[PDB]
Amino acid sequence: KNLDCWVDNEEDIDVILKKSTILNLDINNDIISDISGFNSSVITYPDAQLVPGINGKAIHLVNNESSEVIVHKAMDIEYNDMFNNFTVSFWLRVPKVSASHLEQYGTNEYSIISSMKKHSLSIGSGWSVSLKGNNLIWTLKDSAGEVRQITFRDLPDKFNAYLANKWVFITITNDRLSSANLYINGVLMGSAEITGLGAIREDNNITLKLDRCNNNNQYVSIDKFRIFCKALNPKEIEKLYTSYLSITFLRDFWGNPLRYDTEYYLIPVASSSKDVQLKNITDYMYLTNAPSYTNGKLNIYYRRLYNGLKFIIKRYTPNNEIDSFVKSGDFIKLYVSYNNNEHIVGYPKDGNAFNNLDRILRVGYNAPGIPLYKKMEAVKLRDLKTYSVQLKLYDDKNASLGLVGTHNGQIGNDPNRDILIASNWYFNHLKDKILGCDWYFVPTDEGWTND
Numbered sequence: 001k002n003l004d005c006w007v008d009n010e011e012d013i014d015v016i017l018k019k020s021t022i023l024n025l026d027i028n029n030d031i032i033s034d035i036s037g038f039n040s041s042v043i044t045y046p047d048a049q050l051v052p053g054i055n056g057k058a059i060h061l062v063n064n065e066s067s068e069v070i071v072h073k074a075m076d077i078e079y080n081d082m083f084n085n086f087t088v089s090f091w092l093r094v095p096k097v098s099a100s101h102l103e104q105y106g107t108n109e110y111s112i113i114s115s116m117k118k119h120s121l122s123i124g125s126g127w128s129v130s131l132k133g134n135n136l137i138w139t140l141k142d143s144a145g146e147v148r149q150i151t152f153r154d155l156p157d158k159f160n161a162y163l164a165n166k167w168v169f170i171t172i173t174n175d176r177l178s179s180a181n182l183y184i185n186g187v188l189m190g191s192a193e194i195t196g197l198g199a200i201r202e203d204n205n206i207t208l209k210l211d212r213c214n215n216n217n218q219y220v221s222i223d224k225f226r227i228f229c230k231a232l233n234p235k236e237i238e239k240l241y242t243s244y245l246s247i248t249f250l251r252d253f254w255g256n257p258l259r260y261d262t263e264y265y266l267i268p269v270a271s272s273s274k275d276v277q278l279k280n281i282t283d284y285m286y287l288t289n290a291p292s293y294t295n296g297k298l299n300i301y302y303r304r305l306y307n308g309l310k311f312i313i314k315r316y317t318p319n320n321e322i323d324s325f326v327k328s329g330d331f332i333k334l335y336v337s338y339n340n341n342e343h344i345v346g347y348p349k350d351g352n353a354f355n356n357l358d359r360i361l362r363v364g365y366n367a368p369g370i371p372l373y374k375k376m377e378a379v380k381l382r383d384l385k386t387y388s389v390q391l392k393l394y395d396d397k398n399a400s401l402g403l404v405g406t407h408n409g410q411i412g413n414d415p416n417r418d419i420l421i422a423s424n425w426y427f428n429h430l431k432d433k434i435l436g437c438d439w440y441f442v443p444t445d446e447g448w449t450n451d
């Protein structure tokens, strides 16, 4: 803590994050402003775009020189990082680079955030955040012209990868008396020795914009951009990361808010390589293997997306109000979209159920006279870091029919399958690290396109 900023009380992480923050980009009524107490100024150019963020709206940048945000560092923070420790933390969302783009822009490195005066592949001093292929780069440069750099390679499985259009949380801490550490989602991804460079003298503006990017199509989103005047520690990091994740909103596979009337494919967290298939209208659902995509020469692979059943969420009692956002604790009707029709998902009174308890879900059941329970509550009962949802079924008396999940079993002469069910069993295993009632809601997205 020798080169850290504040000098008061080294115990309360919550209070430490606040007191040590020196720049803080928040967005309110469509304006980006600094919300640390320093009131640095931010100038939002004309083509800076706002999109859903992990908690309110975020900044979306596209590839024209008029899509940018500038921060004019205030008087009393202007120089902080010339010698002291600083930490930069932000949420990022980069689209899965298409294999074509990996071929033709894979050696093109460009910035998205930078404190460092630029000129025709010649650089000032300061730092930048840059992308080159599927690499995320941190980069410190000092008055003498000396550089320190971290290069984090994204894993080759894009379903899991940090640079494949999911929101991820970046934090970079630089302790001038030791290292620069690169974290993603609270984990240490990369690091380098920064002992030895002196005097980081940079631009008086922090700049948000794509810089020297060859692909006319790139975009990226940045939220909650923040500068602390210290190398935060991982226990500080963990707390900073989870603080952004308030349960009150459910999220889609990408980290964006869960909405009604929109098509999502279901993929189970515990079985991420499966899609949902349906036996027949009126019948059960089961897990089947999704088709996968590999490419050797590019070192990349993913299970493909956009097949299996699409579902749609609707409010139980719906009509007049304005929130298209599914709140955890909301009661919904779940439907399957198959040829323009909406077939509600439910469990009919007395439908088979393994063992009398794991109730086999049914798509489109219509047996006259037979009650069909379809009131669901979508909830976030665990695993906050994972953008996943749980779904609870009720019968028509407000008794619980269980969380939605699967159960291996056999039905008639179809083969062994993992059939979708509703069961109260899950409710005793809620601390498990992996659970079978955990769902990803996946909407089509510009950022992910199967090649």
Ligand SMILES: CC(=O)N[C@H]1[C@H](O[C@@H]2[C@H](O[C@@]3(C(=O)O)C[C@H](O)[C@@H](NC(C)=O)[C@H]([C@H](O)[C@@H](CO)O[C@]4(C(=O)O)C[C@H](O)[C@@H](NC(C)=O)[C@H]([C@H](O)[C@H](O)CO)O4)O3)[C@@H](O)[C@H](O[C@H]3[C@H](O)[C@@H](O)[C@H](OCC[Si](C)(C)C)O[C@@H]3CO)O[C@@H]2CO)O[C@H](CO)[C@H](O)[C@@H]1O[C@@H]1O[C@H](CO)[C@H](O)[C@H](O[C@]2(C(=O)O)C[C@H](O)[C@@H](NC(C)=O)[C@H]([C@H](O)[C@H](O)CO)O2)[C@H]1O
Residues within 6 Å of the ligand: 354, 355, 357, 358, 405, 406, 407, 408, 421, 423, 424, 425, 435, 436
């Ligand atoms: C199906 C099941 O195992 N559990 C369902 C549960 O059923 C019970 C019952 O057994 C009980 C029990 O759990 O309730 C009670 C029983 O007294 C004890 N045994 C003793 C004396 O302790 C067993 C025991 O604890 C079981 C665990 O359940 O463990 C052993 C075992 O001793 O038998 C442990 C052993 O190491 C295992 N061996 C091996 C090599 O793995 C075995 C073995 O796996 C099992 O024997 C078979 O899998 O388990 O627990 C049932 O035994 C009972 O069965 C009925 C039977 O179904 C029925 O046919 C029979 O009727 C018949 C006679 Si006749 C056909 C000749 C006419 O009647 C008997 C008795 O009634 O049913 C009980 C009903 O209550 O019931 C609940 C309902 O709420 C659930 O169905 C349980 O299943 C879970 O369902 C979830 C979704 O609904 C998931 O699918 C779970 O699956 C995952 C998961 O966690 O989601 C799926 C994962 O892929 C899987 N991964 C891995 C790595 O395994 C996991 C994993 O299996 C477990 O999480 C633990 O690792 O499950 C379902 O598990």
